[PDB]
Amino acid sequence: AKDPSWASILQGLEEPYHTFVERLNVALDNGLPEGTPKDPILRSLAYSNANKECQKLLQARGHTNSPLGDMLRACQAWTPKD
Amino acid sequence: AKDPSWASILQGLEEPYHTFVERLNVALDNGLPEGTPKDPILRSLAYSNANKECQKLLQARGHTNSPLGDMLRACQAWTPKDKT
């Protein structure tokens, strides 16, 4: 039983963080079973499967009423090398 | 949009990593809807909800066909500052 496709979505080393989060959001929207809450799974995977540089930025992210927004904001100044 | 309880399971600053992962495993067994694959979500939370010291150890973990085992092994020698 291979893992679902949404479990192997990894941020590219040159991929903008917001693009990765958008891809992951759609994969979970489409692939998580009915009645499974997407939001907390998205937030966890958007950290654990982010690239190494963005994981460091995410560890120091904010603590607001918009927890997904806090993750995007923490990486908003990050620039891929290429 | 109150998150489920399994999503607020956080490794204490003084909590052994294996005990934290077990608490995640139980919370998902009882909280995650029956039929949603637990293992990828357990592995994800075992990083995202881990304490900073164990997150650093996890950064150097291996890359095998046993990804949860890689996480457990990476933190298997970490001991909290207060053992009580």
Author numbering:
A (entry chain B): 128 to 209
B (entry chain A): 128 to 211
Sentences copied from the publication:
Human T-cell Leukaemia Virus type 1 (HTLV-1) is an untreatable retrovirus that causes lethal malignancies and degenerative inflammatory conditions. Here, we show that high-resolution crystal structures of the mature-length HTLV-1c CA protein define essential lattice interfaces and identify a distinct ligand-binding pocket. Across the known Orthoretrovirinae, CA is a two-domain protein with HIV being the best characterised. However, our structures reveal that HTLV-1 does still have a pocket formed between helices 3, 4, and 5, albeit an electropositive one capable of binding to either phosphate or sulfate in vitro.
To obtain higher resolution, we expressed residues A128-L214 (CACTD), which were purified as a dimer and crystallised in space group P212121 with diffraction to 1.47 Å resolution. The structure revealed a short 310 helix followed by α-helices 8 to 11. The asymmetric unit comprised 6 copies with two possible dimer configurations: one mediated by helix 9, and the other by an interdigitation of residues R188 and H190 in the 10-11 loop. Comparison to the HIV-1 CA CTD dimer crystal structure suggested the former as the biologically relevant dimer interface, but this was not unambiguous due to structural differences in this region. To improve the CA full-length structure, we re-solved it by molecular replacement searching for three independent copies of the refined CACTD structure as a search model. This unbiased approach returned a CTD dimer virtually identical to that mediated by α-helix 9 in the CACTD structure (RMSD = 1.580 Å), suggesting that this is the biologically relevant dimer interface. Curiously, while this residue is well-resolved in the electron density map from the CACTD structure, it makes an aromatic stacking interaction with its counterpart in the dimer partner that necessitates a breaking of the two-fold symmetry. The positive dihedral value observed for our CTD dimer supports the presence of the immature arrangement in our crystal packing. Y113F was chosen in order to remove only the hydroxyl group of the side chain, which binds to a water molecule, bridging this residue to the sulfate/phosphate groups. Lastly, while we were confident in our assignment of the biologically-relevant CACTD dimer interface, we decided to test mutants at both this interface (Y174A), and the alternative interface suggested by the interdigitation observed in the CACTD crystal packing (R188A, and H190A – see Supplementary Fig. 3g). Unsurprisingly, Y174A reduced infectivity to zero, albeit without affecting particle production.
